[PDB]
Design a protein around this ligand. Structure first.
Ligand SMILES: CCCCCCCCCCCCCCCC(=O)OC[C@H](COP(=O)(O)OCCN)OC(=O)CCCCCCCCCCCCCCC
Lengths: 12, 239
């Protein structure tokens, strides 16, 4: 479930 | 004389100067914006995307929000992304103080006459409506303390029933509402219900944000948005 938002919040 | 929550939020609020520098650094190449005339749609889309990234970074540092699990953090941002972007634009105009032009986060100034020429009916309407809200907030003497409290209120505007951590967010909601009420009553006593008026302005921001989402959806259906656009990802709410 990789999303841009997730990469912004999961320090990566 | 200022609520603790607001004092804390002020410490996390960047300077319009640094945000501008940060975004122009992430944006900038050459073909439009620089030149001025005409106006880059793709560049403005990237500018809005970068503005939201700056907002997400602010949220990540915020008291309470920083204590939540990623799932709760994403749910909160999925509920308020458009409102935070609209409030950000509106506050920028309140400080700008010019009724015939709009100020962008990059520092670019756009004449409203230019918007009338280039924008379609939907976007033109959105820009004009935002300016009406700017006028209301200017008349209410909206200040930085109130602005940061409103941002926090919007961030935690979601009913706690949609989150895992209820107690933490519930307390934040109560603290924020109490802070805005206390601050406005103490600093602007002659504006009887400034607190209520500001909350009504948020109702207006919400309505405007929904119309903004409709504009984005229209652009999406016409395949006019840049690929991998973050605002469109937020619009799809599938994270
Ligand atoms: C979801 C909330 C997002 C908030 C984002 C706030 C961003 C403030 C940006 C203000 C930009 C003014 C540009 C004038 C450019 C001009 O007039 O350009 C005219 C063109 C529009 O042509 P048209 O598409 O109508 O053409 C139809 C036939 N060509 O547009 C652009 O370059 C638009 C690029 C804007 C990308 C912003 C994506 C954000 C949409 C939110 C729209 C929200 C307005 C909100 C007001 C509160």
């Amino acid at each position: 479930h990789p999303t841009i938002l997730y990469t912004l919040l999961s320090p990566g | 004389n200022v609520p603790e929550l607001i004092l804390q939020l002020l410490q996390l609020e960047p300077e319009e100067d640094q945000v501008r520098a940060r975004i122009v650094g992430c944006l900038q190449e050459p073909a439009k914006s620089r030149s001025d005339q005409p106006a880059p749609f793709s560049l403005l889309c990237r500018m809005a995307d970068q503005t939201f990234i700056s907002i997400v970074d602010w949220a990540r540092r915020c008291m309470v929000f920083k204590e939540l699990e990623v799932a709760d953090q994403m749910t909160l941002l999925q509920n308020c992304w458009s409102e935070l972007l609209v409030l950000d634009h509106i506050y920028r105009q309140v400080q700008y103080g010019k009724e015939d032009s709009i100020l962008l986060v990059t520092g670019q100034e756009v004449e409203l006459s230019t918007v009338a020429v280039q924008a379609g009916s939907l976007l033109h309407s959105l820009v004009l409506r935002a300016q009406e809200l700017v006028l209301q907030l200017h008349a209410l003497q909206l200040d930085r303390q109130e602005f940061v409290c409103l941002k926090f209120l919007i961030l935690f505007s979601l009913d706690v029933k949609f989150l895992n951590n209820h107690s933490l967010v519930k307390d934040a909601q109560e603290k924020a509402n109490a802070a805005l009420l206390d601050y406005t009553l103490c600093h602007y006593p002659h504006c009887g219900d400034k607190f209520q008026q500001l909350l009504l302005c948020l109702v207006e921001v919400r309505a405007l944000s929904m119309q903004a989402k409709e504009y984005l959806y229209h652009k999406h259906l016409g395949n006019e948005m840049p690929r991998n656009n973050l605002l469109i990802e937020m619009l799809q709410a599938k994270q």
